[PDB]
Design a protein around this ligand. Structure first.
Ligand SMILES: *C(=O)[C@H](CCSC)NC=O
Ligand SMILES: [Mg+2]
Length: 314
RNA sequence: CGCGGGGUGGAGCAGCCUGGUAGCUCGUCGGGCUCAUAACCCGAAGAUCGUCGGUUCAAAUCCGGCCCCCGCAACCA
């Protein structure tokens, strides 16, 4: 019985779950790697990171290499003589020298059912593209991008009310659980790797505010998904008087229209119906810059002029 | 030292600049009316204006300290 010496590499809260998990699970995390502290969030104050914060607390060795391309840095890994490196939501890329350093190499917890949604935003993209389900996949990291053999998976269906925040939460339960279970297999040698079927390969491009800016050209349905896939970030928004209004909730009304997309059709307690490339999107919850999310009703009771029927939104 | 908006009956807002004067659009309850209504009309309840203190005959308004909320940006992948 020797706990696998583990190097953990992660940044966001999603990683923190996995780390906190390994610890409470009784593993030996020799070192932790995150992104270097930076300005973040009104005031641009130097903020730690979700992962680091947890580490500091647990009194774990932190390593914040700006990159792992540099020899000096790649050494920080090998100097730890680890059995395996668990990677989860880590910005930095891992050079071949590093992937080979751990006795068992590096394994990554990917938020998608590979080979599908290889990339940076598999969670949001899955929900965005309409997928019926999603989940994690613990993989042996190879070279490139999420190309390594897959060891373990766990799936969960995507409801129709799930945002990306809720999907993250759901996978924050499966993830660790899958990670642990796989690490034991790795330790016992009972790991049974699979190879990726290149035909079923789709990539999950990162998110951006531009893509978030509501595009009425798109079907009401694609937007309905955006409005949920882009939550909590960046949040589907539309511009009103050179102002960003974030759209939190929007149902889809199924009754076609020939009006030019962006055209407001109705505006009542039931929501603000707007024409789209196909179908009519029905804004139910909007957030006026500097305010909170509110109901179409609450919003119309003071900005009725923002959504008058006949007018058009861009 | 990053830029910026906001905290007023239950809800969304105006009122502040140029001190007195409680507004607007709704919700709620009662009544009126229609075949009926989520529609209209009339009435009512309901706010020590975020908090503490100062000027003041008098403060939502002008001055100071504080707590809270949000937008950009930044950040995470
Ligand atoms: C980011 O580059 C990628 C997505 C993580 S899935 C939450 N993996 C990082 O380790
Ligand atoms: Mg109040």
């Amino acid at each position: 019985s020797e706990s696998l010496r583990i190097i953990f590499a992660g940044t966001p809260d999603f990683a923190a779950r996995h780390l906190d998990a390994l610890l409470s699970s009784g593993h030996n995390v020799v070192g932790v790697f995150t992104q270097p502290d930076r300005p973040a969030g009104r005031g641009k104050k130097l903020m730690p990171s979700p992962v680091k914060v947890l580490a500091e607390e647990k009194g774990l060795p932190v390593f914040q290499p700006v990159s792992l391309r540099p020899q000096e840095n790649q050494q920080l890994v090998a100097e730890l003589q680890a059995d395996v490196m668990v990677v989860v939501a880590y910005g930095l890329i891992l050079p071949k020298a590093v992937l080979e350093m751990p006795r068992l190499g590096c394994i990554n917890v990917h938020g998608s059912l590979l080979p599908r949604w290889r990339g940076a935003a598999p969670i949001q993209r899955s929900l965005w593209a309409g997928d019926a389900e999603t989940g994690v996949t613990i993989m042996q990291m190879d070279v490139g991008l999420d190309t390594g053999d897959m060891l373990y998976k766990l799936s969960c269906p995507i409801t129709a009310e799930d945002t990306s925040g809720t999907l993250y939460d759901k996978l924050a339960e499966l993830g660790p659980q899958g990670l642990i279970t796989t690490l034991k297999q790795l330790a016992d040698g009972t790991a049974k790797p699979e190879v990726q079927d290149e035909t079923l390969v789709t990539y999950a491009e990162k998110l951006s505010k531009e893509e978030a800016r509501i595009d009425w050209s798109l079907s009401a349905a694609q937007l309905e998904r955006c409005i949920r896939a882009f939550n909590p970030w960046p949040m589907s928004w539309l511009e009103i008087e050179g102002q960003p209004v974030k759209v939190w909730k929007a149902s889809v009304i199924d009754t076609a229209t020939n009006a030019a997309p962006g055209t407001i059709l109705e505006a009542n307690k039931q929501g603000i119906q707007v024409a789209t490339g196909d179908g009519i999107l029905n804004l139910l919850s909007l957030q006026p810059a500097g305010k909170k999310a509110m109901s179409a009703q609450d919003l119309l009771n003071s900005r009725r002029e923002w959504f008058v029927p006949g007018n058009r939104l861009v």
